[PDB]
Amino acid sequence: ATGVFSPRRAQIPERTLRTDRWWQAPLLTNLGLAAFVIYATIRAFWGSAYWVADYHYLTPFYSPCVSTACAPGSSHFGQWVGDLPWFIPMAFISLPFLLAFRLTCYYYRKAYYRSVWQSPTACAVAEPHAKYTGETRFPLILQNIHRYFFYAAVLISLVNTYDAITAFHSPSGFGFGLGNVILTGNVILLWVYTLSCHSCRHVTGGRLKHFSKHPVRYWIWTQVSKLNTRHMLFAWITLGTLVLTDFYIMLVASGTISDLRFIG
Amino acid sequence: ATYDAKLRVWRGDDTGGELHDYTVEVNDGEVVLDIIHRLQATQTPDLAVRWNCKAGKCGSCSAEINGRPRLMCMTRMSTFGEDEVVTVTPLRTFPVMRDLVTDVSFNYEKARQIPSFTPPKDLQPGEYRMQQEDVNRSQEFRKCIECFLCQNVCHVVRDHEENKENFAGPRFHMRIAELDMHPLDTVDRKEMAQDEFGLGYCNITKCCTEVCPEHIKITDNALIPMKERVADRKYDPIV
Amino acid sequence: LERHSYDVVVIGAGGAGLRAVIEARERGLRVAVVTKSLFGKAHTVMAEGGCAAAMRNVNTKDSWQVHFGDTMRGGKFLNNWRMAELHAQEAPDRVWELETYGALFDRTKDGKISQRNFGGHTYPRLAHVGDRTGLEIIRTLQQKIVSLQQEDKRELGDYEARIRVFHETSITELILDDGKIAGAFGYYRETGNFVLFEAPAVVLATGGIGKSFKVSSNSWEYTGDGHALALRAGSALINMEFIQFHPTGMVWPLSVKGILVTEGVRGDGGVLKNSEGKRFMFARRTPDLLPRDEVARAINAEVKAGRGSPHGGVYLDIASRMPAEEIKRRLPSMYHQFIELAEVDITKDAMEVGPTCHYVMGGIEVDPDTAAGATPGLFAAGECSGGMHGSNRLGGNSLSDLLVFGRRAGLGAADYVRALPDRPKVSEAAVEDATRLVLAPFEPKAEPENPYTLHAELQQSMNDLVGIIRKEAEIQEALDRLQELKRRYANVTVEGGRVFNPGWHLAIDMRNMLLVSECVAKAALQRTESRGGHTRDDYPEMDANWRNTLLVCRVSGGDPVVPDVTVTPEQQVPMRPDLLGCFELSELEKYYTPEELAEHP
């Protein structure tokens, strides 16, 4: 055949000789990704139960809310575009950019190249593909623009930070109600994930040659590298925290007590 | 706990081969290479091995110990149960010479295509000055004992023989990164890393870094930074 | 069968061999590089210390005079003084030019090469990177070779126009024309096919002899080749009785069987080394690293008369000592390495340490300025060379020795080749003889001998009877059973073919190992005094006069394992003005006879 069944390579007629469960991690990746995608799509297109008027709670999945069909008070940057027809999500400004940012992420590329595309399914298991070009041809060569989605993600993180800051509200001014805790934790973890990005590491000081003549960027690069060593973990953690933030906010909007600390 | 283990060592040459069942005595604290040496001295005098130091620190004893690319002199052999069969085969990416020895010459052919270190052509040998923080990144890559396990496991060339001439492999793209991050080097190499050594073939599934006996962060510290630099040079609309 | 023509052949790619190749190419020569292992995988990779070079980066009070005195002290003034002086004053240049090749050492605050302190050096001298200095050196040299052949490709249109590397190739004979080098004969490991090189000059640089001993830190390739090659070609060996043994090396767990254990571990709880007794008979110091001859004698006695280990060593327990976390901090690398490699917990269980062969200070008798050879165009450098370290080596001196004298050997070979009227010619009869000799182990040979069994018996005999402590009767018994062992070697039968057959390779290496073992045993029997690495129990009085005597080994005759004669020549008049004054009369009167008469003002 092609890869390990080539004429000059040692005659082993077994696809792999591994005796462990090398297929366990791809399954976990696939179920996690599928669960997040399903939940995110359904909740983003639901179109309701996303805003608490009393405590100014807004789901990140609806965060830039720029339509006149939106709940009163949800538009923090004005109302720009009419009414949406059942297939434009209320957060159509940011959802494409966040989806592209996580689709071009270096970690996520590893995850789905292993899991969906079976590029390596596992490390020493032979491919179900006969030809392979990698990221050299037209579709996959576009993964090299990830830094621009990183810039967009920085802007969207600023928008979410504004949302979290304005969430500290009560019907009598200032308020603190565990929705603030969930939102603030989610925003902090999103910032950690955004700042542990491989493109951030390159842009800050990764592309420099002499760290000795750039003391500030050397320090920034050192801290960003320390964060980047845990980049796999922060992606999954932020997926989870996004899901829980949405779920809690939806529960409160539909109906449930907020567990306020400064009652309003 | 001295017991008799079941090995399933691969025997043959480039014309064909087969796994063979051997029973060898295993003592506590022995590596796979010790078991191979005992088998050589007791049952198979002509078994092909190619070890040199037996302490790590070289790359001679690269094999696939139970489906995983390992060093034979570093595999603890207590990783496996006493009733578990251990299957030792040669590297499956390179042409097989004999039983456990492969023709690792694609690597030495790739080694002399990469431009070498080029210092400024005025600096005298005693007049070099480098700070430690300027050399840490390349010093990490200089830890590489040329075992070529990374080259073996990579799917770009492991599963595709036609990609051998277009892709240099993890070790030599790491070498390009090491020369690029040298504070005193002069040559750029960024364009050639993409155009002649095929950095684009690399998807970053990271199975290399996972086989490195030296624990070099090949993908995170060398390959992704070089891809970002190539994107600086080629794929950045800010021009 | 396969013939190549070159100007010089360097048999071995380590520090010395690669430096010689670079130098010979610089002088302008076609160089063939023959290596028994893969390219860049020589024993040099295993060194973890540094290069001793008086660069003065750390403190500026260092000089080549101080380094020269340190080398002469560590060696008990048995050193070749010209070689020591030349290494002292040429070492910084080689280290500096290493980093013009792309080497990256550790740096100081000023941006210079960092230097560490070591045992026998007065000042910090050892240029280092982590603990991988040998790997850095060999990588730098190999990449410099690749760069040079890239230049050859650009200018002459061929990578191997001036330098070609023949890895996985083993040289078994040196061909002579009229007592002069005419070429080298060997085989390819991969195919078993025979290759003849036809160069008028050969640089040996083949390493050590550590595979003749049961416990050793040396590589698979340290079978004494080079020593035997020069000895059969007609050169001479010196100081073969001077072998470095570390008294404390792991013996039982095969995964760690030659790893050296430093005396820093004994800077804590020491060797219980018995079943029920701490047997060193014990601020009045604990018996912590007494002059390691005394520790070695205690270990030998307790192996013979005492509770020895099943593997022939001692225990050295640190578990029943300072707490587990204190150990894991004081001993970072050793604990991790041992736990991951031998499943031995340093904080829980005792070790299995014992004497281990590390380095051989003897080798081919060289000209100090040029390289070796008496009659032929033969040259030698590195561990296979003899003379620099007299009775004992300083740590760090070997790595810089490699560069200094590899460059000297390459330059001497280039000078010899340029000063040559006509080139010596290989004769076909010699090639037929070498072919017959290397093919002999394939015939049935009634009463067959297994190569592995013979090798193990040789290793056991050398470990038992030629060790740290030598006795006259044990050395005599070692010679007596070496005669029997070399008689049994005539019946060695190899099963299989010629395609990368390691049993055949071992059978070939065994003749060199037997010759080198005979030389070592005879030298150790003849030197009746103790100095450095050579300890005689029946002559404990270190440093007899016995200092202007080299005790040179030569071949007499009778194949296929020739016998040796060891003679006693005098050394050259000690030191011309290398009688510094920091070399006081007080210090020199402990090593020299009242022969100076030309030292004090």
Ligand SMILES: Cc1cc2nc3c(=O)[nH]c(=O)nc-3n(C[C@H](O)[C@H](O)[C@H](O)COP(=O)(O)OP(=O)(O)OC[C@H]3O[C@@H](n4cnc5c(N)ncnc54)[C@H](O)[C@@H]3O)c2cc1C
């Ligand atoms: C474990 C260990 C640790 C050490 N640590 C230190 C240290 O910290 N500091 C220090 O100063 N010194 C150290 N030394 C000693 C030092 O490394 C050696 O003296 C030095 O490496 C010798 O180098 P070389 O170039 O002479 O030979 P090497 O590089 O060891 O090898 C010689 C070459 O010759 C080739 N060869 C041999 N026989 C043949 C043949 N028949 N045909 C073809 N080719 C052949 C071999 O394949 C090899 O390539 C250490 C030694 C050991 C074993």
Ligand SMILES: CCCCCCCCCCCCCCCCCC(=O)O[C@@H](COC(=O)CCCCCCCCCCCCCCC)COP(=O)(O)OCCN
């Ligand atoms: C947290 C939320 C985010 C989670 C998202 C995870 C879900 C990801 C699952 C989808 C990605 C799986 C596809 C990965 C492989 C894509 C197929 C491919 O490799 O393209 C081949 C060809 O197939 C195609 O044409 C691809 C068409 C569909 C791909 C479109 C999107 C997939 C990945 C795009 C990444 C985004 C880059 C663009 C920036 C917006 C070319 O590969 P080759 O080695 O066989 O070379 C042969 C050359 N002819």
Ligand SMILES: COC1=C(OC)C(=O)C(CC=C(C)C)=C(C)C1=O
């Ligand atoms: C393989 O051919 C292609 C390129 O290289 C010539 C590109 O740069 C690009 C542009 C891609 C980026 C990331 C600028 C595309 C789309 C392409 O198909």
Ligand code: SF4
């Ligand atoms: S990189 Fe790590 S794995 Fe690849 S060769 Fe060098 S050491 Fe072996």
Ligand code: F3S
């Ligand atoms: S496994 Fe090989 S394909 Fe790339 S990410 Fe590592 S070099």
Ligand code: FES
């Ligand atoms: S590389 Fe993963 S978010 Fe940027």
Ligand code: FES
């Ligand atoms: S034998 Fe040198 S690396 Fe295992």
